[PDB]
From a paper:
Originally discovered in a proteomics screen, the Ska complex is now recognized as a key element required for maintaining stable KT–MT attachments. The ternary Ska complex, composed of Ska1, Ska2 and Ska3, localizes to the outer KT in a KMN-dependent manner. Although GST–Ska1133–255 is not strictly equivalent to the FL Ska1 dimer in the native complex, and thus might bind MTs differently, it clearly interacted with MTs more efficiently than Ska1133–255. These observations suggest that Ska1133–255 (from now on referred to as MTBD) is the major MT-binding element within the Ska complex, which, on dimerization, can bind MTs more efficiently. Here we have used biochemical and high-resolution structural analysis to show that the human Ska complex interacts with MTs through the C-terminal domain of Ska1, which forms a variant form of winged-helix domain.
To understand the structural basis for the ability of human Ska complex to bind MTs, we obtained crystals of the Ska1–MTBD in two different crystal forms that diffracted X-rays to about 2 Å. Models from crystal form I (space group C2221) and II (space group P32) were refined to 2.1 and 2.3 Å with R factors of 19.6 and 22.5, and Rfree factors of 25.1 and 26.8, respectively, and superpose well with an overall root mean square deviation of 0.6 Å. Residues 133–142 are stabilized in an extended conformation, followed by eight α-helical segments (α1–α8) and a C-terminal β-hairpin. The structural analysis showed that the Ska1–MTBD is related to a winged-helix domain, a domain known for its ability to bind DNA and in mediating protein–protein interactions. The Ska1–MTBD differs from the canonical winged-helix domain by the incorporation of two additional modules. Analysis of the electrostatic surface potential revealed the existence of contiguous positively charged patches all over the Ska1–MTBD surface, suggesting the potential involvement of multiple MT contact sites. Although mutations at K170/177 and K135/203/206 showed no major effects on MT binding, mutations at R155/236/245, a region reported recently to be critical for MT binding, together with two new regions identified in this study, K183/184/203/206 and K217/223/226/227, all showed significant reductions in MT binding (Kd=20±4.5, 17.1±5.5 and 14.5±2.8 μM, respectively, versus WT=2.9±0.6 μM), pointing to the existence of multiple MT interaction sites. Confirming this notion, a combination of R236/245A with R155A resulted in stronger reduction in MT binding than R236/245A alone, and the simultaneous mutation of multiple clusters (K183/184/203/206/217/223/226/227/R236/245A) almost completely abolished MT binding. These results provide clear evidence that the human Ska complex binds MTs through a multipartite binding mode of Ska1–MTBD. Remarkably, the tubulin contact sites are dispersed across the surface of the Ska1–MTBD and distances between different contact sites range between 15 and 30 Å.
Residue numbers in the entry: 1 to 51, 57 to 124
The structure:
């Protein structure tokens, strides 16, 4: 089964990112983080497309689905911690600002929960 993935940002894209957003981040660090996010997305949808601790993950996934979330691909901050070596902390969030800026993902909120939908 095919699963949507977020592409690396390009150098020109990186170059165009407003300097302040970039700050500490190098080009490679950003795409390093994209790599981990895709890993989190992949892992989630394999589970969804799967026929036991993994299976209470499945229900949390269902539970998070929204009118606005549709048949779209998404993850939430807990997914990072669950599937990757990334920490969903402060730098992850600076990074998020870049990912959003480059239209790589969007933030969906509702039910007191922030979902990250793959653009």
């Amino acid at each position: 089964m095919s699963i949507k993935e977020m592409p690396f940002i390009t150098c020109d894209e990186f170059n165009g990112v407003p300097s302040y957003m970039k700050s500490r981040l190098t080009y490679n660090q950003i795409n390093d983080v994209i790599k981990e996010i895709n890993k989190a997305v992949i892992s989630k949808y394999k589970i969804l497309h799967q026929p036991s601790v993994t299976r209470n993950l499945y229900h949390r996934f269902i539970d998070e689905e929204t009118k606005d979330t549709k048949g779209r691909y998404f993850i939430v901050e807990a997914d990072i911690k669950e599937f990757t070596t990334l920490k969903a902390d402060k730098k992850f969030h600076v990074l998020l600002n870049i990912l959003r800026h480059c239209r790589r993902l969007s933030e969906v909120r509702g039910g007191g929960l922030t979902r990250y939908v793959i653009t």
